[PDB]
RNA sequence: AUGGUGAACUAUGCCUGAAUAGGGUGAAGCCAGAGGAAACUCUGGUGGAGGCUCGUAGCGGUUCUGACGUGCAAAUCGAUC
RNA sequence: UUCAAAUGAGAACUUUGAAGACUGAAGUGGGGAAAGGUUCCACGUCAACAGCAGUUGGACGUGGGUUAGUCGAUCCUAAGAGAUGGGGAAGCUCCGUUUCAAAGGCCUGAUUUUAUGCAGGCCACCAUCGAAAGGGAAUCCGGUUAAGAUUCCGGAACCUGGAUAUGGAUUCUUCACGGUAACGUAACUGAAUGUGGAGACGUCGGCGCGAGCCCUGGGAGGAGUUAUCUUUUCUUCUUAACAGCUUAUCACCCCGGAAUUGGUUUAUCCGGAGAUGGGGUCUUAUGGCUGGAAGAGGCCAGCACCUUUGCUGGCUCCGGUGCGCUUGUGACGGCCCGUGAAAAUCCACAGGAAGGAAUAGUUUUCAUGCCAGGUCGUACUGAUAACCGCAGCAGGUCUCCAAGGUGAACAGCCUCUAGUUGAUAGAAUAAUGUAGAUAAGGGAAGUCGGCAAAAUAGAUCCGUAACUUCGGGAUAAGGAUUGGCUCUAAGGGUCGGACGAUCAACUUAGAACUGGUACGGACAAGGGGAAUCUGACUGUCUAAUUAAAACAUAGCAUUGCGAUGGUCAGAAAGUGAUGUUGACGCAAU
């Protein structure tokens, strides 16, 4: 009952494409398919549809923000370096 | 006649059949019919204290 | 051609009623040449083009 | 197109105006006990409606037949 | 020979990009009083798909300055901005995320999107799934501001020109492999008629100059001249240079 | 083992072909068509299916009472009673703070 | 050479619509059980993924180098596919 | 295909009767869209035409026939097409569609010389054409013809526009009450302006439910069968649009305050942001009852009698079943670098300009009543003969409804309803053929080459290699089994407090008996295995000699470009594609 060994979701695409190309798509796969903390909410229910919109289906508030996960970590970093610069022009 | 006694349980032995086991009665199904009686005898079994809303939910996770 | 327009339907019926053998008292006019209407139609051997 | 109840009402109507026809009959049902009993049906044309009455009790209803406007052309069975 | 596929191009025809489905247009607010001079408040009442752009879009509805009424811009959604987020645009809004300011209002190392080229002209720059541009510096000789752009190199633009602070929504698309040329055909089944691509060294002479065949060769260099005509720019263009690299980083 | 025919000269299974199969005072089998359903009314700023108010096709709703429109509340159509609460409340507690804002701008002004 | 006419066939995009028996496989997600000092690991279910599979209609046209080859047919017919 | 009769100068071919058969609901059945255009229907009729024939016809002659407020068109907007102020062009005209433009018309007061000039005033980047499958105001049943019918007849309705009067409701607290609330209602003033909603939307899956169909029990009729058996086989037993009451998964409200966490779907989600529980409110999709409506329709019976026609009576009832079939639909769930039209049109809310009563007025979103609803189409075929292929051509051309058995099954085979039995015919059975079969022994020795043929084949159980991107390979390979009959055991619903009562299904495993050892008995239905070259894969193309190893593809790399731009279009332009674009982009290899 273990059921696969490394493939997981991406037994969806047999034995095509090949390792790699079903190896990276995996990973994204996996975060878009995700059930994500909510900011608003508390509740773990911000599901995705559609690349970039992510939407909590308890309160159903909507956020803007990675293609493939809630959050870019690129994103999250400029979320700081704007903080970080408006703390500064109001002190 | 013949429908007669195929309740009779008579003309389908292991050269009656065509479909695969799956095709004739499909196992989801089975389950759901399986599942459903469980869950409905859980039900009135609570709505009448011969077990408590504790071992219920034991027993409902169990079927 | 079932649901059809005016126009063709119009068209139609002058179709309808050039179609017919030519009256056979004009074989008794005087000096008459004619024998026979030469420009009978049929759905079957001609067709219109609307 | 509808159905009347008030036997008030009912005898309303059987003036009203545009009411100028009504109409009479007589079904041979059954009760729910299985007795062949005689309910009549009363109907009148009103003027994009018509309403028919219900009356089971053969009493109340061979008096009613006596309780038209008689200036109302009604057809009998 | 023939017109060549690439030329064909600029009839439209067959060609148009397919917009059906497509919301309206992206754009900023127009600049006017409030923006110029102040800031003006609106709520984003809902962030939503557009079709055929990777990028979500926020419909974000403003009140009339000049007439009893609501007016819906529609702006590129810049991750992380919210239904429900106050839009604060113009000159003394503040430094947050979503909010729109002009280039002369923001602190050097601000990142910003949608940034307008000229004053007024709702939006040119970093639009795209992901994109951003970085002030670097700035400069009163002049409204003036130099910012770096997604494409690494740096434009000196008017300070009155506005941008959305942040990065654009619709994060990291490209990193996911499309697997299957049915995924692709879907791509541009709502972009416009550019796939497939047929190679034109299987091309026949006539449809290319590369469609010389007998063996499936390019025969000259593959490296054309800025100065050549329609119908002979195929290929590696004014090329500066040619083959692999591991080029690293830009114009620094 | 009866088989039937559409009434109208479209033969094509669209949205507006939608057929009925009836049985009919004459014991045989008839087809009818039938007008696609509706759908009820969404409130305004939350898109729930607006409570009371019938469910016709739009011009439907000109041929009936307005008791059927509404409901009777501010905002009888338009948004949904929790919708209106939460209006209600937030104007309320606003123009409270609004007072308080000034007040307390107007407090510190005096401070300087 | 000049001036005209064709996208009723077909190639491609767009718009709006319509259509596709029955089976084999059993991916994510979820439930329970067993072993174990632990970490974990095993078993049994459930669920129903895929430019997945056997295979009609559909679309196609591999082979017989079949039939026909003054034809049913200026491209068809049969089996096979 | 056959027999006979009828009609006729004349009969293999026409009609009626009988037999024998086919199509087998994926139809040789019943309708339509394109297209045709009278081919439809009746009568007369056979020179030509139907590659034999003809008394027959889709032929020939003569006539008849298509009835609408509700079915379409018509209105709307779609890709697009295209007038206008303009800008190019010697010009035929090209460009542009809100575009560098003085681009209008709505309300209503003034005036009671008048239905009218005007005095208030908001609102308007704005031609039009473009869907008989998209959006869309409203009709159903029965009956009727030689041929028309959602169009005529009869009955029952609804919509739209225009009129309006009576009733009812409302008010001296003027513009309604009730319910804690969700909200209820026969109503219950509402200009400008603003806003919200409907119109209005993908695909797949399992699950719930309706409708029709399928199967079936009792009875009330008719029919078939009856040497003998069967309380038997076949069949009839129906209920429209619309109206009234009633009716729902979802959802929402009140009370209440949860770890021993509970509730809970086939599918694991939900709850202090208020679960479970108790009690309500809504949507009316859909079902039930009644009206419509038995007077209709269906099935029988007894009389009547040249015809037309009847006439009089009965009966038309009460259940059951489900992984059933088709379809409709609900709440969920999977999927996307795809997230799956528009506008006309209808409604509502916010707003409160205004107009309104006490001896009286307000309101026609409540019931009732009066009047009107044009124009064009409407026949029929829709295909092995009504269209396109010179034709009555074995080709081609969009779509809907879909019964029984076997069976996984819309397969194949057999049947019912309906429809055909139409493809020149007679006599013979040489060669050689086209299509279908079979061969002793050998088993590819045939041949460029196993080409052609043969062999395998369902299902249950067991079993299963190298390699591998760990998913596969794999139905690998290799095996046993399979009829009939009689039994055994297990698997459910409902009603009364570990039993008991009642109902209703087939399915699964096991055992005995049996036969010329047969049994997926027809039908249906993979041959397998070891390698080399080669393209990764699914996909594509030379319509009519090449389907491949070629084209494509995902993947990889390179080039150009920051809009005063790159690539491309145009004779020219205030011209155009990318562009509703902006480097996670577009363009070029
Ligand atoms: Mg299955
Ligand atoms: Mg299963
Ligand atoms: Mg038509
Ligand atoms: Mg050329
Ligand atoms: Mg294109
Ligand atoms: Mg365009
Ligand atoms: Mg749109
Ligand atoms: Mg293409
Ligand atoms: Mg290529
Ligand atoms: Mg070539
Ligand atoms: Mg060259
Ligand atoms: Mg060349
Ligand atoms: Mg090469
Ligand atoms: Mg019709
Ligand atoms: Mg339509
Ligand atoms: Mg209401
Ligand atoms: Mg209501
Ligand atoms: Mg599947
Ligand atoms: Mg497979
Ligand atoms: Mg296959
Ligand atoms: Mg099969
Ligand atoms: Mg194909
Ligand atoms: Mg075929
Ligand atoms: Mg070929
Ligand atoms: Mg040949
Ligand atoms: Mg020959
Ligand atoms: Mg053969
Ligand atoms: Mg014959
Ligand atoms: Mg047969
Ligand atoms: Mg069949
Ligand atoms: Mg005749
Ligand atoms: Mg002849
Ligand atoms: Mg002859
Ligand atoms: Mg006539
Ligand atoms: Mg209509
Ligand atoms: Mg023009
Ligand atoms: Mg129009
Ligand atoms: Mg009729
Ligand atoms: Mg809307
Ligand atoms: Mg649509
Ligand atoms: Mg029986
Ligand atoms: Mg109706
Ligand atoms: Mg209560
Ligand atoms: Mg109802
Ligand atoms: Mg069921
Ligand atoms: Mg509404
Ligand atoms: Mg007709
Ligand atoms: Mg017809
Ligand atoms: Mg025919
Ligand atoms: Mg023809
Ligand atoms: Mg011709
Ligand atoms: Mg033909
Ligand atoms: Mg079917
Ligand atoms: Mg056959
Ligand atoms: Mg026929
Ligand atoms: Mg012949
Ligand atoms: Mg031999
Ligand atoms: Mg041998
Ligand atoms: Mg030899
Ligand atoms: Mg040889
Ligand atoms: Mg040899
Ligand atoms: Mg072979
Ligand atoms: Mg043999
Ligand atoms: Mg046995
Ligand atoms: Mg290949
Ligand atoms: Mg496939
Ligand atoms: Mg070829
Ligand atoms: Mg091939
Ligand atoms: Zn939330």
Redesign the pocket.
């Given at each position: 009952?273990?059921?696969?060994?490394?493939?997981?979701?991406?037994?969806?695409?047999?034995?095509?494409?090949?390792?790699?190309?079903?190896?990276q798509v995996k990973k994204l796969?996996?975060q878009?398919?995700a059930?994500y903390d909510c900011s608003?909410?508390?509740?773990?229910?911000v599901?995705?549809?559609?690349?970039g919109?992510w939407t909590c289906?308890?309160?159903k508030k909507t956020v803007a923000g990675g293609?493939?996960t809630v959050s870019?970590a690129?994103a999250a970093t400029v979320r700081s370096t704007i903080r970080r610069l408006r703390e500064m022009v109001e002190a | 006649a013949?429908?007669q006694?195929?309740?009779?349980?008579?003309?389908?032995?292991?050269?009656?059949?065509?479909?695969?086991?799956?095709?004739?009665?499909?196992?989801?199904?089975?389950?759901?019919?399986?599942?459903?009686?469980?869950?409905?005898?859980?039900?009135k079994?609570?709505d009448?204290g011969?077990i408590?809303?504790?071992l219920?939910?034991?027993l409902?996770?169990?079927? | 051609?079932?649901?059809?327009?005016?126009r063709?339907?119009?068209?139609?019926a002058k179709?309808?009623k050039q179609?017919?053998?030519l009256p056979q008292w004009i074989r008794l006019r005087t000096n008459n040449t004619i024998r026979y209407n030469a420009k009978?139609?049929?759905?079957?051997?001609?067709?219109?083009?609307? | 197109?509808?159905?009347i109840t008030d036997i008030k009402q009912f005898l309303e109507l059987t003036r009203?105006?545009?009411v100028k026809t009504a109409?009479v009959?007589?079904?041979?049902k059954l009760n729910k006990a299985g007795k062949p009993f005689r309910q009549t049906?009363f109907?009148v044309?009103?003027?994009?409606?018509?309403?028919?009455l219900?009356i089971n009790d053969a009493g109340k209803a061979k008096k009613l037949i006596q309780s038209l406007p008689p200036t109302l052309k009604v057809?009998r069975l | 020979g023939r017109?060549?596929?690439?030329?064909?191009?600029?009839?439209?025809?067959?060609?148009?990009?397919?917009?059906?489905?497509?919301?309206?247009?992206?754009?900023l607010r127009t600049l006017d009083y409030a923006e110029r001079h102040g800031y003006i408040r609106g709520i984003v009442?809902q962030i939503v798909?557009?079709?055929?752009?990777?990028?979500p879009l926020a419909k974000v509805?403003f009140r009339?300055p000049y007439?009893?009424?609501?007016?819906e811009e529609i702006f590129?959604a810049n991750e992380g901005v919210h239904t429900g987020q106050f839009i604060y645009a113009g000159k003394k809004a503040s430094l947050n995320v979503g909010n729109v300011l002009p280039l002369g209002s923001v602190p050097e190392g601000t990142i910003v999107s949608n940034v307008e080229?000229?004053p007024g002209?709702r939006?040119?720059?970093?639009?795209?799934?992901?994109?951003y541009?970085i002030i670097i510096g700035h400069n009163p000789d002049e409204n003036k501001t130099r910012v770096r752009?997604?494409?690494?190199?740096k434009?000196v633009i008017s300070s009155d020109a506005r941008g959305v602070i942040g990065?654009?929504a619709?994060?990291?698309?490209?990193?996911?492999?499309?697997?299957?040329?049915?995924?692709?055909?879907?791509?541009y089944?709502?972009?416009?008629?550019?796939?497939?691509?047929?190679?034109?060294?299987?091309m026949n002479p006539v449809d290319?100059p590369?469609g010389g065949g007998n063996h499936?060769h390019?025969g000259k260099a593959?490296?054309?001249s800025?100065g050549?005509?329609?119908?002979?720019?195929?290929?590696?263009?004014?090329?500066?240079?040619?083959?692999?690299?591991?080029?690293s980083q830009k114009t620094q | 083992?009866?088989?039937?025919?559409?009434?109208?000269?479209?033969?094509?299974?669209?949205?507006?072909?939608?057929?009925?199969?009836?049985?009919?005072?004459?014991?045989?089998?008839?087809?009818?068509?039938?007008?696609?359903?509706?759908?009820?009314?969404?409130?305004?700023?939350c898109?729930?299916?607006?409570?009371?108010?019938?469910?016709?096709?739009?011009?439907?709703?000109?041929?009936?009472?307005?008791?059927?429109?509404?409901?009777?509340?501010?905002?009888?159509?338009?948004?949904?009673?929790?919708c209106?609460?939460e209006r209600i409340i937030r104007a309320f507690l606003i123009e409270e703070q609004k007072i308080v804002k000034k007040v307390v701008k107007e407090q510190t002004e005096a401070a300087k």
């Open positions: 009952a273990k059921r696969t060994k490394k493939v997981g979701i991406t037994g969806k695409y047999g034995v095509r494409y090949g390792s790699s190309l079903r190896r796969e996996i878009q398919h059930r608003f909410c508390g509740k773990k229910t599901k995705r549809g559609a690349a919109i289906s308890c309160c293609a493939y870019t690129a | 013949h429908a006694s195929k309740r009779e349980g008579r003309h389908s032995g292991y050269g009656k059949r065509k479909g695969t086991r799956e095709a004739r009665l499909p196992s989801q199904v089975v389950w759901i019919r399986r599942l459903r009686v469980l869950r409905r005898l859980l039900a079994y609570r009448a011969k408590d809303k504790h219920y939910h034991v409902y996770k169990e079927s | 051609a079932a649901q059809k327009s005016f063709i339907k119009q068209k139609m179709a309808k179609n017919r053998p009978r139609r049929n759905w079957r051997r001609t067709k219109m083009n609307i | 197109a509808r159905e009203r105006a545009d109409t009959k007589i079904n041979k049906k109907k044309r009103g003027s994009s409606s018509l309403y028919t219900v057809n | 017109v060549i596929r690439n030329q064909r191009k600029g009839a439209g025809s067959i060609f148009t990009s397919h917009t059906r489905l497509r919301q309206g247009a992206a754009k009442k798909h557009d079709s055929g752009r990777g990028a509805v009339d007439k009893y009424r609501l007016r590129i080229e000229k002209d939006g040119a720059l970093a639009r795209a799934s992901g994109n541009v752009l997604p494409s690494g190199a434009k990065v654009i619709g994060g990291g698309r490209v990193d996911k492999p499309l697997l299957k040329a049915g995924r692709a055909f879907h791509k089944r709502l972009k416009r008629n550019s796939w497939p691509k047929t190679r034109g060294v299987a290319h590369h499936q390019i593959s490296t054309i800025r050549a005509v329609s119908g002979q720019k195929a290929g590696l263009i004014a090329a500066r240079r040619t083959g692999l690299l591991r080029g | 083992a009866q088989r039937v025919t559409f009434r109208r000269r479209n033969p094509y299974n669209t949205r507006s072909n939608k057929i009925k199969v009836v049985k009919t005072p004459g014991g045989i089998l008839r087809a009818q068509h039938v007008k696609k359903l509706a759908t009820r009314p969404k409130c305004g700023d898109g729930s299916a607006l409570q009371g108010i019938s469910t016709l096709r739009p011009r439907q709703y000109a041929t009936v009472s307005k008791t059927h429109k509404t409901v009777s509340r501010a905002y009888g159509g338009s948004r949904c009673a929790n209106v609460k």
